[PDB]
């Protein structure tokens, strides 16, 4: 298995979301504030990004987290109408679609290693 943080502010997105990806066996946390002292120790495989950021400043939280867990060790992942990319791996426009999201973060996570099975 695997863990995964989500952050946002909306419960409802929030749920149909950690829906799919705890099916797939992932676990997720979700976090309505996005403090780096949380995230580094709660320090998951990948986190989730949702528009609006509670945190404030996405490129300073990616930077922190970059700074301490290279993108190998941690994926970033942002949610919003655009992607904002501030050294994301990938962006997931809304409306998310489950078809493809699960793909994405599969082809994401899959960059590691050709050898993924």
């Known amino acids: 298995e695997g863990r995964i943080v989500l952050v946002s502010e909306d419960?409802?997105?929030?749920?149909?979301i950690c829906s799919i990806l705890t099916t797939?066996?992932?676990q997720v946390?979700?976090?309505?504030?996005?403090?780096?002292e949380r995230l580094l120790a709660l320090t998951p495989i990948a986190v989730l990004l949702a528009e609006p950021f509670s945190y404030?400043?996405?490129?300073?939280?990616?930077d922190q987290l970059r700074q301490r867990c290279t993108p190998e060790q941690l994926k970033i992942?942002?949610?919003?109408?655009?992607?904002n990319?501030?050294?994301v791996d990938r962006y997931?426009?809304?409306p998310i679609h489950p078809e493809s999201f699960l793909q994405q973060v599969t082809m994401?996570?899959?960059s590691l290693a050709t050898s993924a099975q």
Do not use: N
């Open 24 to 26: 797939a066996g992932y």
């Open 85 to 87: 990319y501030q050294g």
């Open 77 to 83: 992942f942002i949610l919003g109408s655009k992607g």
């Open 56 to 62: 404030g400043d996405v490129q300073e939280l990616v």
């Open 92 to 94: 997931i426009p809304l």
């Open 11 to 16: 419960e409802a997105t929030s749920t149909l």
């Open 29 to 36: 946390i979700w976090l309505v504030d996005g403090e780096v």
């Open 108 to 110: 994401g996570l899959t």
